[PDB]
Amino acid sequence: IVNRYEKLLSQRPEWHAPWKLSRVINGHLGWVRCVAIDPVDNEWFITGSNDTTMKVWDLATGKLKTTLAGHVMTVRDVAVSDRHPYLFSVSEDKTVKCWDLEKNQIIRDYYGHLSGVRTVSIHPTLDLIATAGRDSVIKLWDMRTRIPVITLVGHKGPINQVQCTPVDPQVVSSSTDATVRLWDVVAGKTMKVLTHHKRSVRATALHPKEFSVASACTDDIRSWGLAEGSLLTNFESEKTGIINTLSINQDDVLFAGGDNGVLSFYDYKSGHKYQSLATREMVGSLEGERSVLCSTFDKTGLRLITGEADKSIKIWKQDETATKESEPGLAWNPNLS
C-alpha cells in the first residue's frame, strides 16, 4: 500500500493565495444563520438571522438596503433564484415562504412540514423547490401550485443540508444519521448511499464545475464524485470540529468554517490545507460566540462572506501580493492516516 504513498509525493499541488479580512459589518440583533447572494448582478446579500428578519446588504459598500420581516422565529435558510425574481426563505416556524423581489412581499406559503425546516435549494431547470428539516424527509415542492409533489423518505434522522443538480442525482442530502444520499426523484428512491462519515454531516457544497460535492462532518471533510458516486478525495483535517459550513470558489478553493472560529481554507483538487485563520471575536462578545455559521462566495469568487455567531457579517478578500515570495502554506506533508 506504500505505492499509494509514493503516488502522494509526486503531485505537489496547486498553489493559491492566502485570504484576509476586508470588511466587518455589524447590524443584526441576533446571530446570522444563513447567507445567499444575488446570482446575477452580485449587487447584494440576503442574510437570515436569529432575530427572524432578513437584511439585504449591498455587496459593494456594505450598506444596508432593506429589511424583510415576516417570520416569527429564526431563519435557518435562504435561497435566491436564477431564472426567477424570487427569494425562498425558510425557518424554524415550519414554513417555506416565497418572496417576490419586485414588490418585496410574501407571495406564497408552502405548507406541510411537521417541524422546523432547515434547508431550501432551488432546482436549476425545473421550477421546483427542495425543502428539508427535522421531518427527516425531503419535500419537492411545485413552485407554481404549492403542491408538495414528491416526498423522499430515507434518512433516519434530521436533514441538515440539501442540494439540487440538473442531471442524475437531482437531490443530494445529508443528515444526522451520518450519511449522504444521492436521490433519484422520478422513481423516488435512493440511487446511492454514502456512509463514510462517522457523525452528523452538517454541511455540503457543490463544486460549480467538476460535478461533485464536498461533504463535511466533525473532523473530516471528504469529497464525492456524483454520477458514479465514488469517493474522489479526502481533505487533511486534524480536529477542526465542528465544521458548520463549506463553500467552493470557482478557482477550486474549498472553504471550511469552524465552530472553534478557525477558517480552514483548502485546495479542492489535492486535499491540502494551505491556510488557517482565527477570527477576532468582537468588542464585548464571549470566547464561545466566536464561530462561523454560514458562508458563501460571490459569483466571481474573489470575495467571501461569512456570517458569524457574534452578530456580524465579515467579508474576506484574497490578497493580491502573494505569489511565491511568501505565500507558502503548510506545504504538503501527507501524514499517515
The span from the CA of 21 to the CA of 19, in Å, is 7
**328 touches another protein (CB under 8 A):** no
Whole-Å CA distances, 277 to 18, 21, 61, 169: 10, 10, 24, 35
Smallest gap from Cβ 289 to another protein, in A, equals 6
User: Of 26 and 323, which CB lies nearer to another protein in the complex structure?
Assistant: 26
Q: Which of 215, 228, 152, 216 is nearest to 183 (CA)?
A: 152
DSSP 54: E
Q: Which of 71, 86, 168 is nearest to 122 (CA)?
A: 86
Region of 140-148, 216-224, 272-280, 317-325 interacting with another protein (CB under 8 A):
140-148
User: Of 151 and 230, which CB lies nearer to another protein in the complex structure?
Assistant: 151
Q: Tell how strand 75-80 and strand 262-267 pair up.
A: unpaired
Out of 43, 82, 228, 319, name the contact with another protein by CB under 8 A.
82
**244 touches another protein (CB under 8 A):** no
Smallest gap from Cβ 306 to another protein, in A, equals 17
Q: Which of residues 111-130 bind another protein (CB under 8 A)?
A: 111, 113-115, 127
User: Of 333 and 337, which CB lies nearer to another protein in the complex structure?
Assistant: 337
Smallest gap from Cβ 8 to another protein, in A, equals 27
Task: Give the Cβ contact number of residue 306 at 10 Å.
Answer: 25
Fill in the amino acid letter for 110: Y
Q: Which cell goes with 298?
A: 460571490
Smallest gap from Cβ 45 to another protein, in A, equals 18
Task: Give the Cβ contact number of residue 280 at 10 Å.
Answer: 13
Rounding to the nearest 10 degrees, give the CA dihedral for residues 134, 138, 141, 146. Answer: -30
Residues forming a β-bridge with 198:
none
Q: Which of residues 158-187 bind another protein (CB under 8 A)?
A: 158
User: Of 284 and 331, which CB lies nearer to another protein in the complex structure?
Assistant: 284
Q: Which of residues 46-65 bind another protein (CB under 8 A)?
A: 50-51
Fill in the amino acid letter for 137: V
Q: Which of residues 263-322 bind another protein (CB under 8 A)?
A: 282-289, 291, 309-311
**202 touches another protein (CB under 8 A):** no
Region of 58-66, 109-117, 189-197, 222-230 interacting with another protein (CB under 8 A):
109-117
* H/E run at residue 3: helix 2-7
The span from the CA of 281 to the CA of 312, in Å, is 10
**238 touches another protein (CB under 8 A):** no
Region of 143-151, 203-211, 227-235, 323-331 interacting with another protein (CB under 8 A):
143-151
The answer for residues whose C-beta is within 8 angstroms of residue 13's C-beta and 6 or more apart is: 267, 269, 270, 271, 272, 332
Q: Which parts of this chain interact with another protein (CB under 8 A)?
A: 26, 29-31, 40, 50-51, 81-86, 100, 102, 107-109, 111, 113-115, 127, 134-137, 139, 143-146, 151, 153, 158, 282-289, 291, 309-311
